[PDB]
């Protein structure tokens, strides 16, 4: 009957990467950090690293493919990111096609493009408001400085530590 969620922060607390270069953000990113109001640390079966590949289509929206190793198989999900209100911001394509999804926002918070990135996502599904922040790495490992920054930025949006996880590097599928 009931769900309880930490509220999405106001967008004014989410920076946008200045001068965003869509072409340079393309390619494979490993998710080295993951935080959000629906993300929970689980020492029982710790979360395994997955990857997200961004490809710019001719119309400039992105074809985003995520690949995860689950049940001994590689599982692929594709979504389309459509340029939104400002460079570095996106909305989700073919939303009708997702049952219950009424809003989905993507905001690139910061990236140097060839090593790391921090992306904020907010969506409203079945009337519940979810938000998450991904710390992307061009490699599966990042400095402890970047990880700490991600932790501070996640806390600054209301998230406690048990809502921040560092997926464990694997070789299956994401290589
Ligand atoms: N549901 C998923 O498996 C998923 C994977 C990567 C990125 C996302 O936004 C997702 O929702
Ligand atoms: N699973 C989630 O909590 C979530 C939150 C914001 C955006 C997304 O794509 C998500 O998948
Ligand atoms: Fe999602």
Which features characterize this protein?
175 residues; mainly beta; Lipocalin; eight-stranded antiparallel beta barrel; 2 helices; 9 strands; 42% strand; globular; binds 2,3-dihydroxybenzamide; binds fe (iii) ion; Neutrophil gelatinase-associated lipocalin
Share of helix among residues? under 10%
Small molecules (ligands, ions, cofactors) in the structure: 2,3-dihydroxybenzamide, fe (iii) ion
Count structural domains. Answer: 1
CATH architecture: Beta Barrel
Structural class: mainly beta
CATH fold assignment: Lipocalin
Q: Main β-sheet, in a few words?
A: 8 strands, antiparallel, barrel
Number of strand elements = 9
Number of helices: 2
Distance between the termini: 41 Å
The strands making up the biggest β-sheet line up spatially as 1-2-3-4-5-6-7-8
- How many whole angstroms does the radius of gyration measure? 16 Å
The backbone outline, from C-alpha atoms, is: globular
Order of helices and strands: HEEEEEEEEHE
The fraction of residues in strands falls at: 35-45%
What does this structure look like?
InterPro entries: Calycin, LCN2/LCN12, Lipocalin, Lipocalin_CS, Lipocln_cytosolic_FA-bd_dom. By secondary structure, the chain is mainly β. It has one domain: Lipocalin (Beta Barrel), CATH 2.40.128. The protein is 9% helix and 42% strand. The chain is built from 2 helices and 9 strands; from the N terminus they run αββββββββαβ. Strands 1-2-3-4-5-6-7-8 form an 8-stranded antiparallel beta barrel. A hairpin with a 2-residue loop joins β7 and β8 (128-137). The longest helix is centred in the C-terminal third of the chain and has 12 residues, at 144-155. The chain is globular, with a radius of gyration of 16 Å. Bound molecules: 2,3-dihydroxybenzamide (2 copies) and fe (iii) ion. One 2,3-dihydroxybenzamide (DB1) is lined by residues 36, 38, 121-123, 130-132.
């Amino acid at each position: 009957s009931t769900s309880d969620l930490i509220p999405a922060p106001p967008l004014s607390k989410v920076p946008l990467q200045q001068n965003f270069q869509d072409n340079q953000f393309q390619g494979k990113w490993y998710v080295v950090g993951l935080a959000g109001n629906a993300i929970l640390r689980e020492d029982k079966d710790p979360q395994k690293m997955y990857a997200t590949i961004y490809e710019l289509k001719e119309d400039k929206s992105y074809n985003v493919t995520s690949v995860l190793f689950r049940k001994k198989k590689c599982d692929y999900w594709i979504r389309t990111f459509v340029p939104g209100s400002q460079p570095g911001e996106f909305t989700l394509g073919n939303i009708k096609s997702y049952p219950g999804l009424t809003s989905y926002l993507v905001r690139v918070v910061s990236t140097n493009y060839n090593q790391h990135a921090m992306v904020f996502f907010k969506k409203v599904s079945q009337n519940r408001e979810y938000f998450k922040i991904t710390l992307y790495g061009r490699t599966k490992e990042l400095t402890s400085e970047l990880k700490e920054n991600f932790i501070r930025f996640s806390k600054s949006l209301g998230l406690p530590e048990n809502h921040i996880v560092f997926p464990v590097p694997i070789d299956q599928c994401i290589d």
